Nucleic acid binder design. Structure first.
Ligand SMILES: [Mg+2]
Ligand SMILES: [Mg+2]
Ligand SMILES: [Mg+2]
Ligand SMILES: [Mg+2]
Ligand SMILES: [Mg+2]
Ligand SMILES: [Mg+2]
Ligand SMILES: [Mg+2]
Ligand SMILES: [Mg+2]
Ligand SMILES: [Mg+2]
Ligand SMILES: [Mg+2]
Ligand SMILES: [Mg+2]
Ligand SMILES: [Mg+2]
Ligand SMILES: [Mg+2]
Ligand SMILES: [Mg+2]
Ligand SMILES: [Mg+2]
Ligand SMILES: [Mg+2]
Ligand SMILES: [Mg+2]
Ligand SMILES: [Mg+2]
Ligand SMILES: [Mg+2]
Ligand SMILES: [Mg+2]
Ligand SMILES: [Mg+2]
Ligand SMILES: [Mg+2]
Ligand SMILES: [Mg+2]
Ligand SMILES: [Mg+2]
Ligand SMILES: [Mg+2]
Ligand SMILES: [Mg+2]
Ligand SMILES: [Mg+2]
Ligand SMILES: [Mg+2]
Ligand SMILES: [Mg+2]
Ligand SMILES: [Mg+2]
Ligand SMILES: [Mg+2]
Ligand SMILES: [Mg+2]
Ligand SMILES: [Mg+2]
Ligand SMILES: [Mg+2]
Ligand SMILES: [Mg+2]
Ligand SMILES: [Mg+2]
Ligand SMILES: [Mg+2]
Ligand SMILES: [Mg+2]
Ligand SMILES: [Mg+2]
Ligand SMILES: [Mg+2]
Ligand SMILES: [Mg+2]
Ligand SMILES: [Mg+2]
Ligand SMILES: [Mg+2]
Ligand SMILES: [Mg+2]
Ligand SMILES: [Mg+2]
Ligand SMILES: [Mg+2]
Ligand SMILES: [Mg+2]
Ligand SMILES: [Mg+2]
Ligand SMILES: [Mg+2]
Ligand SMILES: [Mg+2]
Ligand SMILES: [Mg+2]
Ligand SMILES: [Mg+2]
Ligand SMILES: [Mg+2]
Ligand SMILES: [Mg+2]
Ligand SMILES: [Mg+2]
Lengths: 183, 141, 148, 124, 52
RNA sequence: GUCCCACCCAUACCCCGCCCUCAGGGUAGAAACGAUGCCCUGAGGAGUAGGCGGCCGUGGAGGUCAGUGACGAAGCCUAGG
RNA sequence: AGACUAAUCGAACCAUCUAGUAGCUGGUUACCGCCGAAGUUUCCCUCAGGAUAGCAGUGUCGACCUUCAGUUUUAUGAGGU
RNA sequence: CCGGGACCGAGGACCGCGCUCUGCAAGGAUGCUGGCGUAAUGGUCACCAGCGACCCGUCUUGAAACACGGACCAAGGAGUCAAGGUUUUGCGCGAGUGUUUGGGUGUAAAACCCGCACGCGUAAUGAAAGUGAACGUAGGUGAGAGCUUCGGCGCAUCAUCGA
RNA sequence: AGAGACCGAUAGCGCACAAGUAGAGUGAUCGAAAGAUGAAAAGCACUUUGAAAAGAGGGUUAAAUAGCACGUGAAAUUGUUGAAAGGGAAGCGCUUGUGACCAGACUUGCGCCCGGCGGAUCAUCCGGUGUUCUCACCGGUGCACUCCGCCGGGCUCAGGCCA
């Protein structure tokens, strides 16, 4: 006997992508070599972010890029391991350099119209192997419909599952003291 | 471009017409594959530079790939036949595979394959007759 | 595809993953919404708070066409004009001509105002308009006129 | 020819793991089956009963799948397949399929004699 | 008889796949790896001078 | 009843060999690799109800081995391997 | 006499509704590997049964913050066996 | 500091730490010699011998039970399908998305092409008449991967005060 | 009338066959089992034993190990022959012994030297061709001490099992 509380405990994070895209497999080979033989933590973080699933890679917008393109960051390189989406609200798009997993057709058009360049993760590794003069970005993780139903209960102000919305659907008893109580 | 040897290996890694898979190991019946193993290193039909050895009526026949005419398969093979001497063929193959940096890692396999074919073209000695151990008593009658 | 599902892994194991003491009988607990007030109250009160009761007055022979008025905010107003003309206006080369946007032809009835507006005069023809949308369009040099 | 030099081969077991109570009823085959009884003595590992197969009986990775001569079996069907064993004559051995005709059997044996490949079942 | 026999797939993915197959039709190693006998063809995008 | 020597054996403890699981490292100016591979190091292994992963068989469908066969396919018997 | 009405009577026989419902008995089909329980809280014409919390597995993400502890020490409060 | 006995030999060019330093007992066994080359070593099956060993499946706190089912063999024999939800994995497009009710065409129940409407999403809140989202570089404070001209800038998310 | 990622004689309609038939009930009604010799009957002339049925011969056929109880012919259960055990059960696990039977490995390879024999040109050179454009091939030139096989002798090295 050895009297341990845990034994044969597995890891908790992904160690390889579950997707079988061949080009993604090549990209993983590239960044696995860079991360193995480079001191930059940027390579290890990008490598880990290549394994993540779609719900862990939310889209970022042009507006969100323009938000972080202020206060002396107009000359840095934007790195987003996700898709990049055009925003219809932004009327004037500044000049920027973007390295992204993929771009929408309209976002690509508006960037090159403004005078930018759209890169690729492999060209990014070819130009800045250590990631110097770059800023990494993420999308809004909790901005999903399914998250609003999480942890439903009394006094939680979450969203319930109803087949429709109206005065006949829910409300009534337990939502107003005029009919019993409130939550 | 969008196509390369690594991508073709990615596509053909799991299944291809040349694959012979069963228990205890896997093999490949490819013309440009030495040692007849299934691996990226020895997969002739995916790499840009490859070698192949075929037995002739008297000697060895060596085929190589010309990188300049990949899209023209009718004229994409450099062929030559060696039927003079074992040592001379060994030297020619080794120089052909390790003098200008054209797959210098396959020198040992190419020479061994030529050695085996030449060994396999010699006349065979007759095997000695079999003996009996427990049926000798039965056959005594 | 039945070749890979959990029912194939239960072959050879008695009770098929449903337990020995609890034997997966026909209909324990009732069918459907049975027991809403008696033995499923804890579920119908932790979740779905508000199932029972009456609220509000009733409407006879409702026709939803009487209540049709989709709305559009003000920050998407410039997205209605085509891109080629839009970039000319935003670049600022016209300086003497103004566009007239017809919301009804695009399928809208009320013009709400939520975002910001660039300083270019425009003309909007809408069935309804908010007070802030009227103010914001007025400070940009434009005017809004009701059209019905 | 002789095979490559290798470490000695140890089996760790020779018996066949017969099925419980298959020696008393003729409706049960001898193929092993896991007993799922709530009070089975074999499942409870009582002393003096049949053993149970475990992963701890596995063989060495170096000598796995190789016959006592030193080779590994390889199933062939005609004369074109046996030529795949050109580079492996000290590690692999040939095996003729059971449905190959007698005329093609001697063609296979003749070619294998030229290549030096050992044939396990040739005396026929 | 009312089980789901046919399936529905997006026209965008149909066009993506048929374009991928067309692109893969110009790679000679894949032709050999699929079991074709193309050891004696001059050009892999074979074209005929409207003789047919 | 009390005290003192020597000796016997558990799936327990120590050392060594082998299997698996988990964890940590090395491998491209590629003379390179079933990169899902190979090499180095450490620890662990009991189990009903139950959960997950990997593999083995049966009837059919598409592709491929330019696969086997009346010089004997499938099936069946066999203290023969 | 609850007797008899085709070996059938305290409500005949044949087909259909009908695969009538069952909180109740019985059964539920190949292998290996890893983890591994509960009979307890609250409500129910509830007590051979359910919902709810607990115990368990799997899939992860953010740290690698250094964070924590069915434990000891020092200082300082409460108790009525 | 000197004797006696038992079990074991993993690894496979050199590299290291060291010593008594023409070398060695220092990151894992080599040297010499004998008999036999076949039933000799080894393996399968049957029997005698030493020790061990209660009948399976099931309900149960507890089954070898004086608890129930099972004389024997062959074939058949039990979590499926549809509609509607939900979370997670892969894929396409993306502020939009969905060709197939229908029409055109065809080597004809296949494949290919076309469009007006429509569904869900882009705006909520009230029983209802109704109204309808920027004081600020779309805010302040404490943590935050990463980047940096070394001063600082600070994603996601968590907490908190405001609009 | 045309078709199928349907079933394949305990399946598929109750019915692949003289099936809504045979059969049961006074009646309304209930309702089965059962496909396959061989390419062609060429379906065994005749002799003998026997009352007969049958048997033994002899015939047809590629086959009668296909004979109208007919393709292939599994298990429960039974007969003969061969081997073995048994003092109120048998069966089973670990480890030797005896008896029957048996798969592998082994039977040499490599190199060097000396001699014999048959040879047929090795290096070199120049002409042409291909190519990774610097290496190759082909055409001619060589001349015994080069190269290339055969045999006999010798030598070294390694190779089965048990100690
Ligand atoms: Mg242990
Ligand atoms: Mg009231
Ligand atoms: Mg279980
Ligand atoms: Mg049960
Ligand atoms: Mg239950
Ligand atoms: Mg075994
Ligand atoms: Mg028990
Ligand atoms: Mg690793
Ligand atoms: Mg276990
Ligand atoms: Mg199959
Ligand atoms: Mg079927
Ligand atoms: Mg054939
Ligand atoms: Mg056969
Ligand atoms: Mg009475
Ligand atoms: Mg009567
Ligand atoms: Mg009735
Ligand atoms: Mg039923
Ligand atoms: Mg019933
Ligand atoms: Mg455990
Ligand atoms: Mg009540
Ligand atoms: Mg009970
Ligand atoms: Mg700390
Ligand atoms: Mg007291
Ligand atoms: Mg008290
Ligand atoms: Mg020894
Ligand atoms: Mg000796
Ligand atoms: Mg013996
Ligand atoms: Mg006993
Ligand atoms: Mg009891
Ligand atoms: Mg029991
Ligand atoms: Mg009793
Ligand atoms: Mg009972
Ligand atoms: Mg009974
Ligand atoms: Mg069956
Ligand atoms: Mg569904
Ligand atoms: Mg729409
Ligand atoms: Mg801060
Ligand atoms: Mg930091
Ligand atoms: Mg029958
Ligand atoms: Mg039938
Ligand atoms: Mg029938
Ligand atoms: Mg029959
Ligand atoms: Mg007769
Ligand atoms: Mg007669
Ligand atoms: Mg026959
Ligand atoms: Mg027959
Ligand atoms: Mg019969
Ligand atoms: Mg028969
Ligand atoms: Mg029998
Ligand atoms: Mg006995
Ligand atoms: Mg006994
Ligand atoms: Mg000559
Ligand atoms: Mg000459
Ligand atoms: Mg010459
Ligand atoms: Mg001459």
């Amino acid at each position: 006997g050895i009297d341990l509380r845990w034994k044969h405990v597995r890891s908790s994070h992904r160690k390889a992508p579950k997707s079988d895209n061949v080009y993604l497999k090549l990209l993983v080979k590239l960044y696995r070599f860079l991360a193995r033989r480079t001191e930059a933590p940027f390579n290890k973080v990008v490598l880990r972010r290549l394994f993540m699933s779609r719900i862990n890679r939310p889209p970022v917008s042009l507006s969100r890029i323009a938000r972080n393109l202020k206060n002396g960051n107009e000359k840095k390189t934007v790195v987003v391991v996700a898709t990049v989406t055009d925003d219809n609200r932004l009327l004037q798009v500044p000049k920027m350099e973007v390295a992204a997993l993929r771009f929408t057709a309209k976002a690509r058009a508006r960037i090159e119209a403004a005078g930018g360049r759209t890169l690729t993760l492999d060209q990014l590794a070819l130009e800045k192997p250590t990631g110097a003069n770059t800023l990494l970005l993420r999308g809004p993780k909790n901005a999903r419909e399914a998250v609003k139903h999480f942890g439903f209960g009394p006094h939680k102000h979450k969203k319930p599952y109803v087949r429709s919305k109206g005065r006949k659907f829910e409300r009534a008893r337990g939502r107003r003291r005029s009919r019993g109580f409130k939550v | 471009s969008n196509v390369s040897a690594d991508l073709i290996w990615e596509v053909s890694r799991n299944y291809n017409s040349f694959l012979v898979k069963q228990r205890t190991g896997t093999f490949s019946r490819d013309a440009l594959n030495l040692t007849n193993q299934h691996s990226r290193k020895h997969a002739g039909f995916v790499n840009d530079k490859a070698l192949g050895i075929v037995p002739a009526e008297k000697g060895v026949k060596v085929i190589a790939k010309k990188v300049k005419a990949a899209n023209k398969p009718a004229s994409s093979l450099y062929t030559v036949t060696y039927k003079s001497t074992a040592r001379k063929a060994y030297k020619a193959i080794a120089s052909q595979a390790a003098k200008h940096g054209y797959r210098a890692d396959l020198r040992q396999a190419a020479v061994a394959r030529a050695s085996a074919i030449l060994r396999s073209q010699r006349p065979v000695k007759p095997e000695p007759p079999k003996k009996l151990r427990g049926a000798a008593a039965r056959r005594a009658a | 595809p039945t070749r890979f599902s959990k029912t194939r892994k239960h072959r050879g194991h008695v009770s098929a993953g449903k337990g020995r003491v609890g034997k997966h009988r026909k209909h324990p607990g009732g069918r459907g919404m049975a027991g809403g007030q008696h033995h499923h109250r804890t579920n119908l009160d932790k979740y779905h708070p508000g199932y029972f009761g009456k609220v509000g007055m009733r409407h006879f022979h409702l026709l939803r066409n009487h209540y049709w008025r989709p709305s559009i905010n003000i920050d998407k107003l410039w997205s209605l004009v085509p891109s080629d003309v839009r970039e000319q206006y935003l670049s600022g080369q016209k300086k003497d001509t103004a566009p007239v946007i017809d919301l009804l032809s695009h399928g809208y009835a009320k013009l709400l105002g939520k975002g910001r507006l660039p300083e270019i005069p425009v003309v909007v023809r809408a069935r309804y308009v908010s007070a802030e949308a009227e103010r914001k369009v007025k400070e940009a040099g434009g005017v809004v006129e009701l059209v019905a | 020819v002789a095979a490559k030099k290798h470490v000695p081969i140890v089996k760790k077991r020779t018996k066949r793991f017969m099925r419980h109570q298959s020696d008393r009823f003729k409706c049960l085959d001898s193929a092993w089956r896991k007993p799922k009884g709530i009070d089975n003595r074999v499942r409870r590992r009582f002393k003096g009963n049949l053993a149970m197969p475990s992963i701890g009986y596995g063989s060495n990775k170096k000598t796995k799948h190789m016959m006592p001569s030193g080779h590994k079996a390889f199933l062939v069907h005609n004369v074109k397949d046996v030529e795949l064993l050109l580079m492996h004559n000290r590690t692999y051995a040939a095996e003729i399929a059971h449905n190959v005709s007698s005329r093609k059997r001697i063609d296979i044996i003749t070619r294998a004699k030229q290549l030096g490949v050992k044939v396990t079942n040739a005396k026929a | 008889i009312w089980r789901k026999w046919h399936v529905k797939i997006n026209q965008g993915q149909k066009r993506f796949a048929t374009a991928s197959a067309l692109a893969a039709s110009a790679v000679a190693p894949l032709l050999m790896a699929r079991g074709h006998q193309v050891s004696t063809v001059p050009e892999v995008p074979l074209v005929v001078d409207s003789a047919a």
